[PDB]
Structure formats: structure tokens, C-alpha cells
Amino acid sequence: MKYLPQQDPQVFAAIEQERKRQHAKIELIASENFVSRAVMEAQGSVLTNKYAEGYPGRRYYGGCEYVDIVEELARERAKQLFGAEHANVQPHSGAQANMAVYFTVLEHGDTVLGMNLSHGGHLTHGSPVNFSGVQYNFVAYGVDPETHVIDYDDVREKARLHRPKLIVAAASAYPRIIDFAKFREIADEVGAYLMVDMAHIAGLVAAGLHPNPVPYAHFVTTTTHKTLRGPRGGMILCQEQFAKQIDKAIFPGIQGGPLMHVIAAKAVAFGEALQDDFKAYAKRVVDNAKRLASALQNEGFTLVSGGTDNHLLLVDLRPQQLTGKTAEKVLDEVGITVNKNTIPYDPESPFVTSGIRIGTAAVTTRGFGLEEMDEIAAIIGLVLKNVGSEQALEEARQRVAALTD
Amino acid sequence: MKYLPQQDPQVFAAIEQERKRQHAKIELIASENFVSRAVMEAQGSVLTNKYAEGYPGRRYYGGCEYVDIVEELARERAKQLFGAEHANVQPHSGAQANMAVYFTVLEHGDTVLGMNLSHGGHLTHGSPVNFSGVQYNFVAYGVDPETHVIDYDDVREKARLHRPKLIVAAASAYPRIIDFAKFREIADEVGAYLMVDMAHIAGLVAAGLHPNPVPYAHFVTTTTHKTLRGPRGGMILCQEQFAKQIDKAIFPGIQGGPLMHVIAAKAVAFGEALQDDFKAYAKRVVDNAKRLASALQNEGFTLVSGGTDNHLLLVDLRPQQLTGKTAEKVLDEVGITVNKNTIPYDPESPFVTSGIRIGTAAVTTRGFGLEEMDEIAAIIGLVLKNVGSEQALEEARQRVAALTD
Ligand SMILES: Cc1ncc(COP(=O)(O)O)c(CNCC(=O)O)c1O
Ligand SMILES: Cc1ncc(COP(=O)(O)O)c(CNCC(=O)O)c1O
């Protein structure tokens, strides 16, 4: 940086602390990643200065000729990546992508069927303190009590009973592949639209490591910043028949001017995802998650669903008589970042929980491989099995430091 | 830039075209400005990699110690700038800032009183194709047919008749000072909350050139990117009594993870606004707008309300028998960017209009002064009075080029 250090010493010092923090810790928050320098340069561009309400070639402001090229590059690269008939790259976030789809097909008070929030569903999938739960009537389907895999018979029974206008599939903490074909079969049975929120697994979908929801869902929402490794923001994919309605839901519906600099960064991230090395990266993400899962099971940990098919895993800490809150706090003391997370049928509240959620997308981006996954598991074993030992915690800190340099 | 040019030639070429375009044209879109290099550096930082749902010291993710400092710097600088009891610097945009306030105090279907959209009110102030108009019952107050100044007796009559739960004051195209004291007096008469959307005039408010709505309104919303000259995004200011509710409206209410890199850029822009030179800049904005207004009147143009008290002006093109659409198109041919804009009591639809909206915040930022305002007016006079003359248009292009270098 050059102008920030002189203009704003306070902001620059905080940013520099954060940059160093990102290098020194072992980041296992399943929804995070590290973007490239090219993506950051695109978001640090002069495109923030442009008002561009409307869409390419149909704007409400003159002078959009070059930001129109950037938005089209994002839309076309997105379509090549996922094979959707239409893309909307303006959503400011995953929450706004979901909000616009709901605004498109639902009336206030309509019934929506989504994944139980304590079994893996996201906050925007019906939480009562979120707009989704306040605006609409959400009902939930759950996972089997023993396998922790979505119970498709429960999806079907709830759909037939409650007759939702929309069914939402996908999650913030589900470690197994989701069967979009079964979701669409159920939606067709009850005449409901199907929305797939692939935010967590978009990068895996793009690399062919997770079944693509596009061919099965009427609408596909996502964030661009998790496994897709892009700038922070959202995107909506949909069939051509809902294109005009989805575009109008975003604008003039729920947003105003789009973040053109962020859309440029989205295009950049999509170009990166279209390359062969991104496909190799994604395979390493899933391979690392499987390895990490196995290594944790080797340490004596119980995993929700018995392992993982994607980038994330959930540890059920009941066997160690620990809450997720306790485990997150002690791991933070040694330099490992995880988040507490409810497990299916959790006896504890969502503010305490009986689990921790872990993902490998970020450590994979920094170059960690299978041997590092074994060591991370061994460090987590040392800490969680010896929470009252300061010597074990100090050893863990030195082992974390050895991994991050 | 260094990594973008090699990684993505297509995106870099489009951005570079846009950067050069910003220099070569005379930008008079009232809602635009040019941010500093320090602000862009903050948005191009590694802070995009951090999930930070929740607020400083009360996050739902560990590792937020340094992004907490950045958010607090933004909130505290905002409070010093505007004197509000509380600030929320997470809104992704002006639309999301407004959406969260509405989510805080209104139930679906509640009555809201806002400025007539064809007299200056914004799209998020009740348009029927926007969430505001779909979710709530908007009624409107207008400006006097001759003076084009808000008719406060009409505000009061509509409030007493319709008994709104909320009254919204402020606009996207009102060239005169708004009397927040009268708005609060009316709101108190009918027991309504008062919300002031100061997006367009925030920078003028911060420099003491427009009365501050903070002491009169329960809620103040704004964008950070117009006269405030910050990154693209929103902010909510409010009294301490609504602080917890407003914070919960933003999260877990209507958004998810905030854009921490953009919040860092907001803090940077707020630090710039707290400096004496920003106060001198803002005075030049208003001085330039007055000068430009007078110079246009000297060319024979009629201005809505007869001039301006702020950064923007509206030309009523009926005397020249031109629509705003026609004037915007021909000015685009010579390198001058304006937007068509309905005028009060406009006989034409909002897609054609009888006016153009012009603002001086951007040309002031690039260093234009009073002499440049006279020349811009003289160029607009030459073009609009000679729309069928290609020689007049070519002369205008050379004069525009002389101003931008
Ligand atoms: C499945 C899923 N959907 C939407 C969001 C919201 O995105 P945002 O950009 O934060 O508004 C999320 C976010 N999850 C954060 C977390 O999982 O850590 C999500 O998972
Ligand atoms: C008064 C007023 N309020 C909210 C917005 C919305 O902001 P955004 O960041 O675009 O969601 C605006 C925007 N106006 C754009 C225009 O005036 O050109 C506004 O004016």
C-alpha cells in the first residue's frame, strides 16, 4: 500500500495487524478463504465511482459502456462455470441473493420448506430473527438421528403436509453430498419451486466434485467468497424463464446501485475458477477434508455423519464432554480458529452447542496438504483432550507456529 | 496495478477504459464522486477474507480483534462527524440502510409518508416496483407547483389524514434545504417516527453547509458514496434508544457478513471528512452549484425551484421544447454526463421526462472552480440550443476536451 499508510495510520495499522493475523493463525472457519491479489486489485479499483443501476445495455445512467463489459464478463464466465441459462452478479451478499429469490416467488406469509437450522440450515433459511422467518412461514426437514444424512422421506412428508410454495435445499453445515434430483422430484410432487443455496459448495460444484444443482433447481443462489474463493458478495443463477423476474427482483426490487468494483472482482474469481489449477485446488480441498476427518477419528473424535464428502466436517464433542463454545475458546488460545456449531439433535442451545465446524478451503489455499492435515488433527487432539494443561497448550502453540512459519 | 493485468487482461482492459473515461468526461451525475487512493486501498485489502457477523466485541466468529478496531474507528468517526448517539456502518448500500430502518419500525402493510417520487423522492421511498412500495403502504407529500419547495402544509395534511407510522424526509433530486424541524414537528403531531435519508447531502451536512437532521430525526440513513465522497455502501445513525433494535435489524435481520474491507474504506472516508480541507471542498461544491445554476440561467435555462441551496440542480427543459431523454443523449455525444430526471408536475413519463439533474460534487473533487462552472454552462447552452447542428456539437466536444485536458 502507498497512500493509506500516510493518510490513515490508525486504519493502516489495524489492516496490517489483520494481514499478519491471517498468516499466523490456522484458519479452519469453513466459510472463509484467501482471495488472490488480482481479485483484491479489482475491488480496489476506480469502478467504485460508477453508478450503474439496471443491467448491461439497459442502464439508468449514461457512461456505463466499460462497466457493462465487466458485468457481462462476470455473467458469461458464471454461465460457463455452472452451465446456467441466466446469471445475476449484482447481489451484494448471500443474504441479498436469497432475499431476491424469495421476493421473486413468494408473497408475505407464504410457506417455505428448508433445512432445520440446528441440522445445517442457514439463518436466511427461516430463522425467526431473520427476514426469512419474519416475512414467510418456514417449516423444516431434518437429518436422520443416527446417520445425520438428510432424511428425504422427511423432506417429502413435510412438503406434502405443509404444501410449501418453495423448497430450499442446501446448508451452512452439512458435510455430505446433497441429492438435488430427489429435492426436485419432491418439489414436482407438491408443485413447489426448488431453490438451491450452494454458497458453501459453489467451488466444489464448479470443479465437478459436487453434483451441480443447476439442472434440477429453478433458482440457485450462492456467495462468491467461500469455496469459490472470490470477493465477498452473492450471485443468483436461474432458468431463462425467471431471468427478467430475478433481474427485476434485484433492481428495482431489493437493491440500488451495484458494487461494480466487486462485480469486476467476481469476474476475476470466475476466470480463476475456469482454470485447470482451480480444479486441482478444489480436489485438494476435499481430499484434505477427508484426510483431516480420518485423522480426527484416529485421535478419538466422533464426526457428525461419520466423515465428509465436501470441504467441511462437524465434530460431535459429547464424547469428550465438551461444548463447542469451550472447544472454540481453547483452540483460539493456541492459534487455531474454528466455530462452535450445533450438531443435529443438539442438547445445548445454539450459543453453547456440542460441536465445532471445521473446513479446509483456506488452509488448502495457503498450500497445506495431507501431512499438514494429520498434524492439525494431532494438535486438536492434544488440546481438546488436555484442556486443563497449560503445557499441552504451549506445545500446541509451538506446533501451530511450525505449520504457519 | 500489478497482478490483475497479467491474470485477467480482459478485466484489466475494461477497468483501464473506465479509468480513462472518468478523466475524459465531464461527470455531472449528482450522486457520483471520485474517492481517494487511500479509500480504494482500504477496499482492495485482505479484510475481504474475514467473516465478522455481529458487532465489535460481540461477534459470532473468533479472530475479529483487528476488524473490530476498524469497525469502531468507522463508528466513532461517524459519531464525531454527525453527532449521532449511535452508528451502524454495516449497511451494504443506501437501499439496505433504508430497508433495515423500515424492518425495525414497520410491520408489513404499515402506512409510510414520503416525498412524491416525481418531485424528488427516491425509489426506496415507496416506488411500487421496489420493496418499500410492495411491503408497505406509501402515501406522498409534494412540492408547491410554482416554487418547487416542499409544501409543509401538504406534509402535515397528508400525515394527519393518513396517520403514517413513519414519515420519511429527504430526496434524490431536491435542490433546496430541507427543514427537519418542521418534519419533526409534524411527526410529533401525529405520533409518527421521523426518518431522514440524507444520502445526497451527507457531505454537506458533515461540513456544516446543510442543517443536520440528527437532532430532529429518530433515524438518519445515508450512503457513504455521494457528497460524503466515500466507498459505495450505506450507514444508519440513530438515538441510543433504537441502537440495539437497528443493530439487530442489520444483523441477524436483513444482512449476513458485513464487507469489512468496505467498512475500513468508510472509516478512511470519515477521517477525510473530519479534516478542514474537506470542509473547504464541500463549500466549493455548493459555491460551484450556485455558480453553475446562475450561469445556466444566464444562458436562458429555467431551473426547478429557481436555483439551488446544495450540490444539485434540475433544469426544466420545457422552454427549449426538449425532453430530459433528448438532452441527456446529445450531452453524451459531446462528453458531458447528466441524467434525465422528472421535474415536479412533469407532463412526461419518468422514462422520458422534461428535465436533467446535474450535481457538482465530482467536478469539484477534480479541481473545477467558478470559471469552469461558467464554461460548462456555456457549453450546455451551445449544445441544447443547437441540437441539430453538428458544428455546434463538435465545438462543444473541443471545449469539453479543453476542460478535462
Ligand atoms: C448457505 C449460506 N447461504 C447464505 C449465506 C449468507 O451470505 P452472506 O454473504 O454472509 O450474507 C451463508 C453464510 N454463511 C456464513 C457461515 O457459514 O459461516 C451461507 O452459509
Ligand atoms: C436519497 C437516496 N437514498 C438511497 C439511495 C440508495 O442507495 P444505493 O447505494 O444506490 O442503494 C439513493 C441512491 N440514489 C442514486 C441516484 O440518486 O443517482 C438516494 O439518492
Side-chain angles (χ1 to χ4, degrees), chain A residues 5-337:
Chain A
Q6 183 46 221
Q7 141 95 115
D8 206 321
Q10 293 185 302
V11 169
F12 182 69
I15 289 175
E16 284 292 283
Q17 281 172 300
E18 175 56 18
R19 186 174 61 77
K20 296 163 178 178
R21 185 200 73 77
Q22 288 179 20
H23 168 85
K25 307 293 182 172
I26 289 178
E27 177 61 82
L28 300 177
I29 286 174
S31 52
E32 290 188 344
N33 213 330
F34 301 115
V35 293
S36 66
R37 290 175 297 199
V39 163
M40 284 184 297
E41 278 178 22
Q43 327 203 260
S45 73
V46 297
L47 273 54
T48 187
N49 297 149
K50 194 76 186 67
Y51 243 107
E53 294 167 323
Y55 292 93
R58 299 284 183 274
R59 304 274 195 195
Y60 299 93
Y61 297 87
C64 287
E65 291 95 349
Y66 309 122
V67 305
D68 282 358
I69 295 160
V70 172
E71 182 161 351
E72 282 282 31
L73 288 167
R75 293 193 307 190
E76 289 301 305
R77 291 169 180 186
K79 284 141 64 177
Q80 186 170 346
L81 220 34
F82 298 106
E85 279 177 351
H86 186 248
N88 188 124
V89 297
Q90 293 190 200
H92 293 320
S93 67
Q96 271 51 250
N98 293 357
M99 178 180 283
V101 171
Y102 299 157
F103 190 71
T104 297
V105 297
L106 305 173
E107 288 163 353
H108 174 259
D110 277 345
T111 299
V112 189
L113 171 64
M115 195 171 190
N116 186 308
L117 261 58
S118 65
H119 299 190
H122 187 244
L123 180 81
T124 57
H125 305 165
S127 165
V129 291
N130 177 255
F131 76 97
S132 61
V134 170
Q135 184 78 190
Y136 315 106
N137 179 42
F138 272 78
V139 290
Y141 51 81
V143 302
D144 180 276
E146 261 39 306
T147 67
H148 311 313
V149 176
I150 287 160
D151 183 337
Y152 293 92
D153 297 301
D154 186 52
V155 180
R156 178 173 174 253
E157 176 179 303
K158 298 290 191 280
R160 289 173 77 227
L161 176 52
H162 298 289
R163 306 302 312 270
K165 185 148 170 196
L166 177 71
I167 297 179
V168 172
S172 291
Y174 185 59
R176 292 304 183 162
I177 286 161
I178 295 163
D179 185 332
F180 304 124
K182 290 186 180 189
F183 271 99
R184 179 55 180 281
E185 189 191 335
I186 291 164
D188 287 347
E189 183 172 8
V190 302
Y193 290 91
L194 169 68
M195 170 178 133
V196 171
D197 177 352
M198 65 171 183
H200 259 87
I201 62 172
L204 308 185
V205 167
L209 302 168
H210 188 291
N212 187 346
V214 169
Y216 302 98
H218 296 99
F219 311 94
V220 175
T221 61
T222 189
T223 51
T224 47
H225 50 273
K226 294 181 184 62
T227 48
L228 197 47
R229 199 162 72 175
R232 186 168 298 279
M235 173 163 72
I236 299 165
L237 308 178
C238 69
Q239 17 269 77
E240 193 49 39
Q241 73 176 127
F242 308 108
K244 181 158 175 197
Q245 300 156 288
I246 282 292
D247 284 352
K248 294 167 306 194
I250 281 293
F251 186 88
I254 67 151
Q255 294 184 356
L259 310 183
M260 298 311 314
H261 44 127
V262 182
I263 288 166
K266 287 173 188 175
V268 178
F270 303 161
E272 294 172 5
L274 286 166
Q275 298 279 266
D276 288 343
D277 66 357
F278 181 88
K279 284 71 177 80
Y281 159 69
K283 188 179 175 284
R284 292 196 298 283
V285 170
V286 173
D287 281 350
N288 278 348
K290 255 91 288 177
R291 180 74 176 226
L292 183 53
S294 185
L296 284 164
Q297 288 171 141
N298 186 242
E299 295 298 314
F301 293 109
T302 293
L303 300 185
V304 169
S305 86
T308 175
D309 298 331
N310 55 33
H311 62 301
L312 78 69
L313 62 84
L314 262 180
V315 182
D316 167 2
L317 294 160
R318 290 173 294 187
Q320 289 70 42
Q321 289 293 105
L322 299 170
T323 57
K325 179 180 181 305
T326 293
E328 170 188 67
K329 179 186 170 64
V330 69
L331 290 163
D332 177 77
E333 296 184 16
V334 310
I336 295 172
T337 316

Side-chain angles (χ1 to χ4, degrees), chain A residues 51 53 61 92 251 254-259, chain B residues 29-32 92-96 98 120-125 170-173 197-200 221-223 225-226 232-234 339 357:
Chain A
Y51 243 107
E53 294 167 323
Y61 297 87
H92 293 320
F251 186 88
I254 67 151
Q255 294 184 356
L259 310 183
Chain B
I29 286 174
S31 52
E32 290 188 344
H92 293 320
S93 67
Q96 271 51 250
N98 293 357
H122 187 244
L123 180 81
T124 57
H125 305 165
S172 291
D197 177 352
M198 65 171 183
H200 259 87
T221 61
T222 189
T223 51
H225 50 273
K226 294 181 184 62
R232 186 168 298 279
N339 52 266
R357 180 185 71 170

